[PDB]
Structures are given as C-alpha cells and as structure tokens.
C-alpha cells in the first residue's frame, strides 16, 4: 500500500503541481508535466494500491482550475481499474 502526499498549500502553479507529482510518485526523469504524461504515468508506471492524500486542495484550486483537471485524471484512472484511494484533507 503505497502513499503519495500533496501539500496543497505549497502548490503555486500547475507546473509546480507536476513537479511535486514527479517527486512523490518517483516518475521517470523525462516526465512530460502535462495531463497526457500524467495519464501515461498512472497507467504505465505507478504501482498500486495507492493512497493519494491531497491536503488543502482548496488552496491548490486557487493558485490553480488546473488542480481539478489533475484530480480528474486520478479519478478516471480509478474508474478504469487503478486501485487508488483519494483523500482530500
């Protein structure tokens, strides 16, 4: 049971969000830092089960609408078989 943590109050941009994901999920060095690259990582790199804890999501949404698009990719992966548990704390 792997765990990834996003401290929402430290996310200041969509680029920063991708950099954090790259670090937390130990993604490949060439990670594209975009929604398609994220989907690629969730379907071809990340190991499950995974618990994704995104603290202070409301703040990420503000510093940024890009946060919701990222969250949506995780939820889509979950709907499509990935054993992911998302905690919005």
């Amino acid at each position: 049971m792997k765990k990834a943590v996003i401290n929402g109050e430290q996310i200041r941009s969509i680029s920063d969000l991708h950099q954090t994901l790259k670090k937390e999920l130990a993604l490949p060095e060439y990670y594209g830092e975009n929604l398609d690259a994220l989907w690629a990582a969730l379907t071809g790199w990340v190991e499950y089960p995974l618990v994704l804890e995104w603290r202070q999501f409301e703040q990420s949404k503000q510093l940024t609408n890009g946060a919701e698009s990222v969250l949506q990719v995780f939820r889509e992966a979950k709907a499509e078989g990935a054993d992911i548990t998302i905690i919005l704390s």
Binding site: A26, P28, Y30, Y31, G32, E33, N34, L35, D36, A37, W39, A40, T43, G44, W45, E47, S69, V73
Partner: protein, 108 residues
C-alpha cells in the same frame, strides 16, 4: 523489427494496424512487466508498448467529430522506456512526440 517513426508510420498507413512487435500495457503487465523494474524485454522479448488509447488531454492534436487516437512507443529496444511516442488517429493522421507528450509534430 519495425520501431522507428517513419517505419511505424508507413506500416500503420499500409496495414492500418501496428507491427507484430507491439503489445498493450494491459498485455505486458499480465506477462509480468513492472515498469519500475525495467523488465519489459525480459518478460516480452522483442516487444514494445503500443496500441493504447491516447486522449489528447491537452488538446494539442487536431480534433474532429468521431476522431480518436492511439499511441505507441518508438525507438525502444530494452530496459526502461524512453520519451518517444507515435500518435495515430482513427482516420489515419500520424504525429510524433519526443518529449513525453509535451509537443507534437505531424509526420504523415
């Protein structure tokens, strides 16, 4: 083994399917592939990942009513995967990315 941008593009335009050296991630995983282990060549000798649906989430590729996309790995031999991917549509437009889906270039 056909795994170059032009080689695979030509094959796709001609046969409307990927070369026999391609397998989906679902298939690869079932065969024992674990990305973090970089063991694709160990469980599936001579194979490259390819055929899965590409959703064009950033909207960089041209969209059209009914058009869908798929992707495949390019220049892969063994070990960990790289950042090269070929993108092909249901109506056979063909694009390439060498920066892990950041930018795309039409090649057919």
């Amino acid at each position: 083994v056909i795994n170059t941008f032009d080689g695979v593009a030509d094959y796709l335009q001609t046969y409307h399917k990927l070369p026999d050296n391609y397998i989906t991630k679902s298939e690869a995983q079932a065969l024992g592939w674990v990305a973090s282990k970089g063991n694709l060549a160990d469980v599936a000798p001579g194979k490259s990942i390819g055929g899965d649906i590409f959703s064009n989430r950033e909207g960089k590729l041209p969209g059209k009513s009914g058009r869908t996309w798929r992707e495949a790995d390019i220049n892969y031999t063994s070990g960990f995967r790289n950042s090269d991917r070929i993108l092909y549509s249901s109506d056979w437009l063909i694009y390439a990315t060498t920066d892990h889906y950041q930018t795309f270039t039409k090649i057919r």
